[PDB]
Design a protein around this ligand. Structure first.
Ligand code: H64
Length: 207
């Protein structure tokens, strides 16, 4: 298990997301489903010029899995997935500018629900999760497990769990007072309200 420090700007973004009083927390689901949709769009596009990229799975969809026992809400997709480079250096590099613009916008009248227009909606996961675990698999890399409870650092490890084929699982370890996001009625409401037009099947699991 390797431990890394988030770049200062990202750690700052996460702290703001965690400390700012902001009641409209449900927007986290929209951001994650949107990220899944972009990832699915990408593998689909790429497969048009190279069909073999779908040998790791032809089905393009999204699953929302709540589990009260583990108090987790997992967003699963069979999208493009992320490499080790994405997880450790590239995604953070890109996120640095998005964060800067977002934090300046926030000081102008913008609010946290607009975080997605700055390309860093992933971090809105910390509005409801005390810890986020990301299991991802990209076609020409191995399956990895990224993890962070914020605090300025994250870990990355080669995942020996059950193989996924290709895609990403964002496991949200929910805060004690945010278990409403494990309720079927609540999730259905949010999906219908913010992601009703996603171009991929979204299956909400029942417990
Ligand atoms: C071009 C690239 C920057 N777009 C993808 C951003 C990374 N990403 C994201 S957003 C993201 C995810 C992270 C992350 C940072 C971001 Br930003 O570190 C922990 O895992 N969600 C994705 C997903 N479901 N599938 C594939 N890629 C995902």
């Amino acid at each position: 298990v390797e431990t890394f420090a988030f770049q200062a700007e990202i750690a700052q973004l996460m702290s703001l997301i965690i400390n700012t009083f902001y009641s409209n927390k449900e927007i986290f689901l929209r951001e994650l489903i949107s990220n899944s949709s972009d990832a699915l769009d990408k593998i689909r596009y790429e497969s048009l010029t190279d069909p073999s990229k779908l040998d790791s799975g032809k089905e393009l969809h999204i699953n929302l899995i709540p589990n009260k026992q583990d108090r987790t809400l997992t967003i699963v997709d069979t999208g493009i997935g992320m490499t080790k480079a994405d997880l450790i250096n590239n995604l953070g590099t890109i996120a640095k500018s998005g964060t800067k613009a977002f934090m300046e916008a926030l000081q102008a009248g913008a609010d946290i629900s607009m975080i997605g227009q700055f390309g860093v909606g992933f971090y809105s996961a910390y509005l409801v999760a005390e810890k986020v675990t990301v299991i991802t698999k990209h076609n020409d890399d191995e399956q990895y497990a990224w993890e962070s409870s914020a605090g300025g650092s994250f870990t990355v490890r080669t995942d020996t769990g059950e193989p996924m084929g290709r895609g990403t699982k964002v496991i949200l370890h929910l805060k004690e007072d945010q278990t409403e996001y494990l309720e079927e009625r609540r999730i259905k409401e949010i999906v219908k309200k913010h992601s009703q037009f996603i171009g991929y099947p979204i299956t909400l699991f029942v417990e």
